[PDB]
Design a protein around this ligand. Structure first.
Ligand SMILES: CCCCCNCC(P(=O)(O)O)P(=O)(O)O
Ligand SMILES: CCCCCNCC(P(=O)(O)O)P(=O)(O)O
Ligand SMILES: C=C(C)CCOP(=O)(O)OP(=O)(O)O
Ligand SMILES: C=C(C)CCOP(=O)(O)OP(=O)(O)O
Ligand SMILES: [Mg+2]
Ligand SMILES: [Mg+2]
Ligand SMILES: [Mg+2]
Ligand SMILES: [Mg+2]
Ligand SMILES: [Mg+2]
Ligand SMILES: [Mg+2]
Ligand code: NA
Ligand code: NA
Lengths: 361, 361
């Protein structure tokens, strides 16, 4: 698509601004310039650009209904594109650090950054930190004199923190809360009592929905000067509900989509994740199924994973997924109708964002 | 000292604001609240608070010469204290990630955060990320309506990036630039040609001097409304020169101060660091000393480190340290005299910051 090439053109411009800055102001040499350009490319590119492109789509909606000079249109789209790359590079930061943390081997068809032979955990941790700095550099440089600067930086901060908090929920999810203790090595849960829908929705709301839905949609608004025309409590509710659905699809795929299509080898049973499949499982299983789950879940052992998969498969979790899906379709359409009151244009951009999610892979 | 207790009181207030926010807005539970309170305490407290206290000292200087109401004084000091904790928590973020990266075992008399039995690399990486978020949260909450907000956030950003860039220099310093390549495992240098004063000063300028001297001194200014009364090019030059001296002292100690006094076991010879001692060594050694250095430097082997230490010891690097020190005393006093023209009060706060550094441990 032509729009995605134009989006990528803003990325080249941004990469070129960033590296030229490191050469003229940070005394960087060409080899380290090169190593950071490849790190940037490897960690930021290759995905679908769903988050980044959403910013552009929202602003586009507003430009179709709104009087501007051509130059203002170009300005508005170029800001939406910059803003989008801010979110793509934030994501890039969290995925680098997440793959170190989740013990992961592959992503987007390639080895995780830290697993490249010339990188190692050592560099990649700092590379990830650089990725997020570059998001603030981009903001301060391209939005220097935009009336939305401060609001944009405050919202980005808040989204970044929520994400880090979510990550903390996610990584502490196989542990019993009463056992969390920096002094004592964390033993895996044996009861699985915190594997509940309420806990799962919590984990998911923070680790995924702020940065993948709330941030793109609001940034589209921010860069459009369009925030005072939508109901923000509604933007929050629809973002949190679509992104929760998006995570649930993530979780299903980790288990049941072949690595070839997923392009990232699935580690949820091994890692003992609080996934949608394990929670939904424990919500319908009889006593002996539960006991078999407990003897097997959470271990690298290739045969103990089969047992889990077959439990999941025989429990019929596609029935639960269709009830779940059908109920999300109801609330998402309902929120879309409510956004129509104040903002018909934004409602339609949410409808598009919903449509693309609901159809993914 | 009473001032350090008052500084710590602002920390309790800040910790209490942060955790209460996680409970009322982030749906956090008490066990995870507890785990983050201990993580905060363990990673932020225990040091000298040199950086944080410098902010307070600079503002104090300005309050001695400047007409204010009492309430404005209390406001100004409380901001300086908040600002100081911003720098202490930034440092805390970088040291958590640095100890993962440097392979380190101890710090400030205790095991490095990631080595606590209930933490692990997995959590600590994210804990470190949280530490830096908390610095933006503090800024946005306590400096909400201060005329310096934007300047303070832009300077903090810039300092944070410079630090991350420096870290990248530091971690890539045992590698030959022409060999840096994400695809190929990085072999240790065998020529040590990039172990030069110019390279060392570069590494050091970025990884240490921005966040440890430039940021504290400028933040003192920012919170004082006092920036337009100093020459900023001079603040940059004196900060970069004292902090370089501070790193050189760091490097000497890593080698020659007993672990008991250092409270952090020294890993510079093992890690093959571009330290001041190795550069200064290679600047005076004859041909066979150099060759012995090369056969020995950069290996965990307890006897290969002795050989390096004895080379360092027999080469007489205290002669070079005194010439170095004496020359830093000359330029630092010279910059202090130049800061006197526009700002006698700030000059004296630099003189105090210089004095404390020059006398440390
Ligand atoms: C931005 C925080 C990092 C989490 C992003 N998503 C990673 C997902 P992955 O892409 O690893 O499947 P997870 O939640 O780990 O299943
Ligand atoms: C803030 C960037 C992290 C570097 C801070 N200083 C760590 C020093 P350490 O305290 O590890 O001796 P290094 O430079 O590693 O000798
Ligand atoms: C990180 C997660 C949750 C995997 C889902 O795909 P992405 O979120 O990588 O989507 P794109 O980067 O391709 O838009
Ligand atoms: C991190 C380094 C370079 C070690 C020097 O001491 P600190 O910088 O830890 O000083 P304080 O935190 O005690 O002020
Ligand atoms: Mg994860
Ligand atoms: Mg993951
Ligand atoms: Mg997943
Ligand atoms: Mg280091
Ligand atoms: Mg270190
Ligand atoms: Mg050191
Ligand atoms: Na960062
Ligand atoms: Na952070």
């Amino acid at each position: 698509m032509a729009s995605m090439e134009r989006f990528l053109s803003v990325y080249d411009e941004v990469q070129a601004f960033l590296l030229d800055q490191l050469q003229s102001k940070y005394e960087i040499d060409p080899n380290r310039a090169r190593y950071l350009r490849i790190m940037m490319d490897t960690t930021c590119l290759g995905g679908k650009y769903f988050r980044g492109m959403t910013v552009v789509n929202v602003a586009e909606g507003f430009l179709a209904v709104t009087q501007h000079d051509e130059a203002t249109k170009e300005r508005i789209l170029h800001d939406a594109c910059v803003g989008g790359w801010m979110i793509e590079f934030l994501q890039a930061h969290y995925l680098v650090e997440d793959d170190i943390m989740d013990g992961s081997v592959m992503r987007r068809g390639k080895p995780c950054w830290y697993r490249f032979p010339g990188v190692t955990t050592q560099c990649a941790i700092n590379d990830g930190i650089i990725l997020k700095s570059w998001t603030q550099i981009m903001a301060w440089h391209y939005f220097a004199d935009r009336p939305f600067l401060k609001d944009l930086l405050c919202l980005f901060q808040k989204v970044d923190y929520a994400t880090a908090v979510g990550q903390m929920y996610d990584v502490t999810s196989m542990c019993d809360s009463n056992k969390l203790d920096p002094e004592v090595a964390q033993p895996m849960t044996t009861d699985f009592a915190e594997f509940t829908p309420a806990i799962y929705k919590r984990i998911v709301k923070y680790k995924t929905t702020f940065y993948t839905y709330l941030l793109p949609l609001v940034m589209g608004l921010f860069v459009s000067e369009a925030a005072a025309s939508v109901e923000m409590n509604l933007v929050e509710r629809v973002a949190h509900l679509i992104g929760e659905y998006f995570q649930v699809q993530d979780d299903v795929m980790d288990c049941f989509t072949p690595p070839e299509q997923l392009g990232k080898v699935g580690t949820d049973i091994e890692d003992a994740k609080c996934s949608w499949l394990a929670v939904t499982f424990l919500g319908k299983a009889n006593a002996a199924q539960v006991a078999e789950f407990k003897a097997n879940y959470g271990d690298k052992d290739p045969a103990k994973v089969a047992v889990v998969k077959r439990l999941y498969s025989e429990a019929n979790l596609q029935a639960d997924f269709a009830a779940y899906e059908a109920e999300v379709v109801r609330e998402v359409e309902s929120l879309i109708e409510q956004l129509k009151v104040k903002s018909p244009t934004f409602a339609e951009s949410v409808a598009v964002v919903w449509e693309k999610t609901h159809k993914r892979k």
